[PDB]
Amino acid sequence: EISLPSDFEHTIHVGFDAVTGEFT
Amino acid sequence: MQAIKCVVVGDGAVGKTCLLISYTTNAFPGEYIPTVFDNYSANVMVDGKPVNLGLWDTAGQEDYDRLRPLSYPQTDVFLICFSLVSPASFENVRAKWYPEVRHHCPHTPILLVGTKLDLRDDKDTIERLRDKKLAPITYPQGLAMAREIGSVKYLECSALTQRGLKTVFDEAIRAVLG
Ligand SMILES: Nc1nc2c(ncn2[C@@H]2O[C@H](COP(=O)(O)OP(=O)(O)CP(=O)(O)O)[C@@H](O)[C@H]2O)c(=O)[nH]1
Ligand SMILES: [Mg+2]
Numbered sequence: 001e002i003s004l005p006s007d008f009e010h011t012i013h014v015g016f017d018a019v020t021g022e023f024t
Numbered sequence: 025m026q027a028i029k030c031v032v033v034g035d036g037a038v039g040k041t042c043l044l045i046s047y048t049t050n051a052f053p054g055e056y057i058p059t060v061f062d063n064y065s066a067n068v069m070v071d072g073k074p075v076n077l078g079l080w081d082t083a084g085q086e087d088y089d090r091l092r093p094l095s096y097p098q099t100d101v102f103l104i105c106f107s108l109v110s111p112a113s114f115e116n117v118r119a120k121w122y123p124e125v126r127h128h129c130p131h132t133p134i135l136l137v138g139t140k141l142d143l144r145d146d147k148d149t150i151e152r153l154r155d156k157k158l159a160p161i162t163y164p165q166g167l168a169m170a171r172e173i174g175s176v177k178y179l180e181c182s183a184l185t186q187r188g189l190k191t192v193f194d195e196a197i198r199a200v201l202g
Contacts, residue, residue, distance in 0.1 A: 001071065002068055002069070002070050002071075002190075002193075002194045002198075003068050004190065005047065005048050005066040005067065005068050005077065005193070006066065006067050006068070007065070007066055007067045008048045008049050008064065008065070008066050009064065009065045009066075010063075010064055011063045011064065011065050011078075012062060012063035013061075013062050014060045014061040014062065015060060016060050023060070
């Protein structure tokens with residue numbers, strides 16, 4: 001069977017700053 | 025460790041991020057923060073062996089149409105998402121998401137996921153739609169769309185209550201690994 005998930009990691013975050021017009 | 029790459033796409037506001045975060049953390053996001061690009065990782069045990077889930081969260085906004093395919097190469101399974109209480113988002117499954125994904129990934133399995141299942145029985149939501157002569161998308165209607173776009177499975181869930189949520193990812197896994 002399949003278990004519930006574990007070990008969450010937020011590996012990549014890309015943002016966008018509309019004032020600077022750049023990705024964060 | 026075996027690894028599976030799953031990419032989640034669909035209209036703005038459908039609940040892609042909440043789906044992924046509620047599943048992987050059991051915490052439902054408090055804010056509505058539109059996504060640009062996020063990758064999450066989680067592990068599951070599948071028939072006694074661990075599998076790493078690489079979960080790729082994408083932007084529903086058309087602004088990101090040129091960027092979005094950065095996520096697509098080497099994808100094992102797609103979740104195309106629409107809100108069960110947004111007929112516009114449902115139409116875009118066919119009009120936008122299916123053709124986008126297929127162009128880049130001609131053979132990759134697609135699961136069609138109806139989100140916000142908790143709102144289909146929500147009185148205020150039903151009334152808001154009924155005011156405009158609309159109703160929530162029904163399970164047979166969603167299934168018909170899944171068939172039209174050649175989805176390997178149609179699933180419905182609420183990130184909020186978690187009803188059907190585990191099953192979405194279980195079926196995504198089985199779509200890849202059997
Ligand atoms: N009632 C209910 N609301 C939900 C559910 N999932 C998401 N939402 C709500 O819908 C809104 C959008 O959720 P979000 O997960 O950010 O949507 P998204 O598709 O990632 C938005 P984008 O494409 O811009 O990144 C939020 O207000 C969130 O609370 C659900 O299962 N039930
Ligand atoms: Mg998002």
